[PDB]
Design a protein around this ligand. Structure first.
Ligand SMILES: CCOP(=O)(O)OCC
Ligand SMILES: [Co+2]
Ligand SMILES: [Co+2]
Ligand SMILES: [Co+2]
Ligand SMILES: [Co+2]
Lengths: 330, 330
C-alpha cells in the first residue's frame, strides 16, 4: 500500500503520472563526489535537474523512477535534494547495471541478494533512503555474473514485493532469456518490466512477452540520432529510428490488447559521464523537452493517432502504480 | 618540499621509517559506503586498521603510503580517521589501477591529467586532503587506456613534483615499457617507483632499471601461498615464492650497489573486497604481523645475512623521504 521514494513512503494515489525509467545523473560509483567538475559543478548539475524536473512537473509528471544503480553512480542524497526542490517524487533503485566493479563482480548470488535486500529493507548507504525498484542489465546472452544478478534480483523481489526492471539490447531479444531466468526462480512476470523494448521493430517478440504477463518498457522514445547520423557515438547510443516510430509501438501494443502491460518513459538524464564527454549536450540538442517529452510530445501524438486520453492515462498513471506497489503477484 | 599526508603537509624530518606501498582497504569506488557490512561494519574495519597501524608503529613505522586509487575504493576520510587514531602518517594516492569504471575509461589523456591534478593540487572529493603520490598499473603490455593513464601520470608528476609508483607483472618486465612511456613524456626516473618488482628473479632487469635512476619497489615481501598451495585463489594472488626469496632480492640489489634505488613494503591491507570474500582472513593467516612484517621479520632477516643496520635505515628512512619530497629531479 506504499511506494518507497527518496522522501519516504508515498501512497498509490500520490504517485500520479509516473515516468518509469529515468536518471538524475548517469555516472559511475563514487565519480560524482570525486570529480564533480566533470559536470561543471555539483551545484550546476543539481540546478539543471531542478529546472528539468520543474518543467516535467508543469507538464503533468508527479513521479520519476530513477533506475540508476550503484554502478550508474546513483547518489541518493542528490536525488533527495532535487526531489525536494522540484516537488517531484523520486523512486530510487537497487540492483546492478553493466559496469559493476570487482568488489561486486566477485560476489555470489547469496551476497548480491543480501546487498539488494539491504538497499530495499534497510537503506542506501547511510541515508536511510530505501529503494523501490530493482534494476538489472544484460547486453546479449547473460554472463555468469549477470545470471547471478538476475537471480539475486528475483530473490530480492520475491522477499519484498519490489519489482524488477531491465536493460536489454532488444535487437538481441534479451528479454526472452531474462524471462527464462526470472521464471526459473519462480518470479511472477507481473513484477518484471523488460526495458528498452522500443529498440526493436519486432512486434511479435514484444507481444509474446506481453502475453506471458511481462510489462513492456517503451522507455527510449526520444532517443534518436536522426539529423546527426554522421555522429558515430551518438548514432551508436541512440539509434537511427525516429521518435515517432518508437511511439507507434505504444499504439501497436494497445491495439493488440496489451494496454495494461505498457510502461513508457524518456530514459532521460541531467548529467552523463559514462560515455563521450559532451553526450549530455548532444542529447539535449536532440530533445530540448527532456523528461517533458512524453507528456508534451508523445501523448498528443498518440491522441492524434486516435488513442483515447483515458488509455494514455491508464498507461502513465495506473500501470506504474500497479507495477511499483509491493506485491508478489500483481 | 613538504610531503602531503591525510593530516596535512609534513617535512622530511617528520616522515621517519616509511612503508611505500600499503593499503588501508583494497576495495572499489563507492563500495565501502554502499556495503560497509561486507567488512563487518565500517567501525569494525576502522578498529582493525587502527590496531594494525599501532602494531606497525610499535615496530618502528612512522609513515605509510596508501597507494589505493579512486578505483581501489580509496576513502580518504577513513584514512584520515585511522591516521589520527593510530598516530601514523598516511600519504594518499591519486592515479588509476586495474578497475576504472566507464566514467574513467572513456576519458582522454588531458581529462585524466586534470583529474590527477585535482587530487594533488585541490584535494580529494570535498575533503581538502591532497594526494602525495600517483599510482598507475599495467599487467603485461599496456592497454590503450593504460597508456593514457601512464602519460597523464607523467604529466601530473611533471606539473607538481609528486612521484609516480606502479603495479607491474614483473616476470613480464612491464617496467621496461612503463619506463619507455614515462621517458617519452620526459619524466625523470628519479620520480618513478617500479613496484611489485620482488615478483621477478631477473636481476638483470631490476639493475638495468635501477641504473637508469628508477626506484625499485620490493613491496610484496610477505605475499606467499606456501603452506596453502592448493588454495587456487590465494596461490594466484600471492604466488608461491617464499618471503625469504623476495627478501634476498633486497640483499642482491644492495650487493650490486643499488641501495639508494630500493623501496621496501608489505603491500598489506586491513580490508579487501575486490577478490574472494574472505581473502583478508587468509592473508592474516599467512602474515599475522601485517604491516609490521618488514620491520619485525625482514630487517632482522637481512641483518642476519650481513646487511648493516645503516644500509637498512638508508632504505627504510632516507630513500622514501627523497622519493616523496616533491621535485622534478631527485
Ligand atoms: C588493492 C590490492 O592491490 P594490489 O597491491 O595490486 O594487490 C594486493 C594484494
Ligand atoms: Co539501459
Ligand atoms: Co537508463
Ligand atoms: Co598492485
Ligand atoms: Co597494492
Amino acid at each position: 500500500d506504499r511506494i518507497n521514494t527518496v522522501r519516504g513512503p508515498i501512497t498509490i494515489s500520490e504517485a500520479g503520472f509516473t515516468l518509469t525509467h529515468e536518471h538524475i545523473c548517469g555516472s559511475s560509483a563514487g565519480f560524482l563526489r570525486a570529480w564533480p567538475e566533470f559536470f561543471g559543478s555539483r551545484k550546476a548539475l543539481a540546478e539543471k535537474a531542478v529546472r528539468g524536473l520543474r518543467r516535467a512537473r508543469a507538464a503533468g509528471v508527479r513521479t520519476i523512477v530513477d533506475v540508476s544503480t550503484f554502478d550508474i553512480g546513483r547518489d541518493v542524497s542528490l536525488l533527495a535534494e532535487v526531489s525536494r526542490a522540484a516537488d517531484v517524487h523520486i523512486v530510487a533503485a537497487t540492483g546492478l547495471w553493466f559496469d559493476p566493479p570487482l568488489s561486486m563482480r566477485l560476489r555470489s548470488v547469496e551476497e548480491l541478494t543480501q546487498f539488494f535486500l539491504r538497499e530495499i529493507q534497510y537503506g542506501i548507504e547511510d541515508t536511510g533512503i530505501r529503494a523501490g525498484i530493482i534494476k538489472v542489465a544484460t547486453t546479449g546472452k547473460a554472463t555468469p555474473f549477470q545470471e547471478l544478478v538476475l537471480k539475486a534480483a528475483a530473490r530480492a523481489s520475491l522477499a519484498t514485493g519490489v519489482p524488477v526492471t531491465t536493460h536489454t539490447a532488444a535487437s538481441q531479444r534479451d528479454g526472452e532469456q531474462q524471462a527464462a531466468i526470472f521464471e526459473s526462480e519462480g518470479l511472477s512476470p507481473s513484477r518484471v518490466c523488460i526495458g528498452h523494448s522500443d529498440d526493436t521493430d519486432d512486434l511479435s517478440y514484444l507481444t509474446a512477452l506481453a502475453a506471458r504477463g511481462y510489462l513492456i518498457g517503451l522507455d527510449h522514445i526520444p532517443h534518436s540520432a536522426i539529423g546527426l547520423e554522421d555522429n558515430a557515438s551518438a548514432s551508436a547510443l541512440l539509434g537511427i529510428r525516429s521518435w515517432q516510430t518508437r511511439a507507434l509501438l505504444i499504439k501497436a501494443l494497445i491495439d493488440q490488447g496489451y494496454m495494461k502491460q505498457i510502461l513508457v518513459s524518456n530514459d532521460w538524464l541531467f548529467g552523463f559521464s559514462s560515455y563521450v564527454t559532451n553526450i549530455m549536450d548532444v542529447m539535449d540538442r536532440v530533445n530540448p523537452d527532456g523528461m517533458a517529452f512524453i507528456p508534451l510530445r508523445v501523448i498528443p501524438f498518440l491522441r492524434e493517432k486516435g488513442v483515447p486520453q483515458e488509455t494514455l492515462a491508464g498507461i502513465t498513471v495506473t500501470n506504474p502504480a500497479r507495477f511499483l506497489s509491493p506485491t508478489l503477484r500483481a
